[PDB]
């Protein structure tokens, strides 16, 4: 049989795909539960549980016909029940009742849903999801959304069987394979914390013909043994291996695999640094006095200070820590929205953002937002902005240097080198009499509970954070909404809570940012809409409330996977996250073989995208 063997690095807090917005959950559930639609190898949206669909002429009513052979299975593979339209009613009501962390995807879109969530109504029958019959689910929206179908690839719109959900109660969706039912390509055979994730092909899945591996086995990787990836690939145990050009082992690796190193493309997941604008927790700090803590609290609210950090942060040096000197720039990402995420009359989003920067000050003159280069690092500009910040901050009694805590996992050797790089860059440019980056090396549990898995803003224990966003649907709002003060998914990472904007949020202008988002969202013409979102992205770059850093992809690997066999998606959870479509082979792929396959894929993608646009018109009814 055919097996894929590699590693994983993030244990999930749960399998609750209806309540979670973390990739630690959806990366797993992508393989276990299907929704209405999915992706092909080219990023087109194709049938999944829904074999057909229509949209009304006014754009408000979407109706999906579910295929009759789709079933729910237990973790052991036994059939539980057919998938029915009611399962989509159940899923949305459960997501609403549980206050899902991904509710922003649906709460302002589905008719009646906001009223139900906020208690203006108590009757879910007034909410715009209905099972018209066992095979037909109908959604009613508040306003047209050309990106609505792309939202169905997000797990909050996935179904759940109501009887199973009732039987499980509070046990539903725990980190245990028996806590959910399965209707997707795989069953989960093992889920062991800090050890293993194992998938087994479900032979009775409706689309089993498109599952080309029988088993997927992932061993836990904590970052302490980066050479283990190539070592186990060469030993024949892993199907692929990410390469680390800084290793002492790399010279021998590049000689042995001179014709096999493959670089991936940068993808739509964007990372950035942000500041904690309202820090409450100080378990992990080098500050020892209230004056230091209050000084840092003031500094992060100062725009000139944030801009000075931005201009002092050498992204090339940062990327070199993981990619080596020659690949250092291959991972660089300079906006939250990828520069090619959308186009406006033939011009990419990033070029439009650059043109909007003309109105945000001389410090942005000539900026270029293309991937793969560093347009931010500029020591002279950083020093000048810092001088302005220092005058403003000293007048408030702020003490210098400003100490900024950044966390990192003690086992994450490459991550330690990355954070050491930012410390060296910022302190070298601005002076350690002005800024100190204090690196806090934490255990796994401490790192989790003070960051990604912290449950409130008050538990965020750092001054600087380095997280990222993967897009949920095909519109710039998926990225730019994450900082809005009403419901932004990234607010807690900034130390803020969704709701009324507090004095810290207003001090940095996030109330104004939120009003801008509301106005842009009303625009229905794509070109005008995207231009308004480009101005919003420009505002955010200027605010330096985010410091764009890197993307996923752009990295070297060795591979025994078949090039371009897997699903690909610009947004959602049904692309690279899924082991459906993926194929393995005996031969180690060569760089030349991969390049030939890539050119074929690029060409076919354009052809297939054009066909997919023509297929769309047939669905208007």
């Amino acid at each position: 049989s055919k097996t894929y063997n590699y590693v994983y690095s993030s244990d999930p807090s749960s399998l609750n795909y209806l309540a979670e917005n973390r990739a630690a959950t959806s990366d797993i559930v992508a393989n276990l539960v299907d929704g209405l639609l999915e992706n092909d190898q080219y990023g087109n949206i194709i049938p999944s549980l829904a074999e057909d669909w229509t949209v009304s002429q006014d754009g408000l009513t979407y109706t999906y016909k579910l295929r009759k052979d789709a079933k729910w299975f237990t973790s052991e593979g036994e059939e539980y029940a057919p998938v029915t339209a009611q399962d989509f009613v159940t899923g949305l009501q459960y997501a609403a009742d549980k206050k899902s962390e991904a509710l922003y995807l649906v709460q302002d879109s589905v008719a009646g849903l906001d009223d139900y969530i906020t208690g203006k109504t108590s009757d879910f029958s007034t909410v715009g999801v209905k099972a018209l019959d066992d095979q037909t689910v109908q959604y009613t929206l508040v306003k047209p959304e050309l990106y609505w179908n792309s939202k169905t690839l997000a797990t909050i719109l996935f179904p759940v069987n109501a009887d199973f959900l009732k039987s499980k109660g509070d046990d539903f969706g725990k980190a245990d394979p028996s806590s959910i039912l399965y209707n997707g390509p795989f069953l989960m055979k093992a889920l062991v914390s800090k050890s293993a994730i194992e998938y087994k092909k479900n032979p009775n899945y409706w689309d089993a013909k498109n599952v080309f591996v029988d088993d997927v086995k992932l061993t836990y990787y904590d970052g302490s043994d980066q050479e283990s990836l190539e070592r186990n690939f060469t030993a024949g145990a892993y199907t692929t291996a990410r390469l680390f050009p800084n290793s002492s082992s790399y010279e021998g690796i590049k000689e042995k695999y001179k014709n096999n190193i493959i670089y991936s493309m940068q993808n739509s997941t964007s990372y950035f640094f942000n500041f904690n604008l309202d820090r409450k927790s100080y378990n992990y700090t080098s500050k020892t006095s209230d004056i230091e803590k209050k000084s840092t609290q003031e500094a992060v609210l100062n725009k000139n200070f944030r801009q000075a950090i931005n201009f002092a942060f050498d992204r090339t040096s940062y990327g070199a820590q993981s990619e080596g000197k020659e690949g250092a720039t291959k991972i660089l990402r300079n906006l939250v929205v990828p520069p090619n995420f959308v186009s406006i009359k033939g011009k990419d989003f990033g070029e439009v953002v650059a043109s909007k920067m003309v109105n945000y000050g001389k410090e942005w003159q000539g900026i270029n937002f293309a991937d793969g280069q560093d347009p931010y690092y500029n020591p002279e500009k950083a020093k000048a902005k810092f001088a302005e910040a220092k005058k403003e901050l000293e007048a408030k009694g702020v003490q210098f240097p400003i100490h900024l805590d950044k966390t990192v996992e003690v086992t994450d050797k490459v991550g330690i080198q990355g954070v050491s790089s930012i410390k060296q860059s910022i302190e070298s440019v601005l002076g350690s009499d002005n800024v100190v980056i204090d690196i806090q090396q934490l255990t796994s549990d401490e790192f989790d509970s003070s960051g990604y898995f912290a449950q409130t803003a008050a538990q965020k224990d750092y001054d600087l954070y380095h997280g990222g966003w993967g897009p949920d649907y095909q519109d710039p709002s998926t990225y730019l909404d994450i900082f809005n003060t009403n419901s932004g998914g990234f607010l807690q990472n900034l130390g803020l809570e969704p709701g009324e904007a507090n004095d810290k949020a207003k001090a940095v202008g996030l109330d104004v940012y939120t009003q801008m988002l509301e106005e842009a969202n009303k625009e229905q013409d794509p070109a005008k809409r995207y231009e308004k979102y480009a101005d919003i992205q420009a505002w955010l770059i200027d605010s330096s409330l985010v410091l764009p850093s890197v993307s996923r992809g752009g990295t070297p690997s060795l591979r025994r996977t078949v090039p371009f066999a897997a699903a690909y998606g610009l947004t959602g959870t049904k692309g690279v996250e899924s082991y459906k479509y993926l194929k393995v082979q005996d031969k180690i792929v060569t760089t030349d073989e991969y390049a030939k396959a890539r050119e074929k894929w690029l060409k076919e993608k354009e052809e297939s995208n054009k066909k997919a646009q023509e297929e769309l018109a047939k669905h208007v009814k």
């Binding site: 690095s9 993030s10 990739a23 990410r242 997280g467 949920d472 996250e577």
Partner: peptide, 10 residues
């Protein structure tokens, strides 16, 4: 979706 990393994945 909220992401961590980046680390060695697919």
């Amino acid at each position: 979706v909220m992401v961590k990393g980046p680390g060695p994945g697919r």
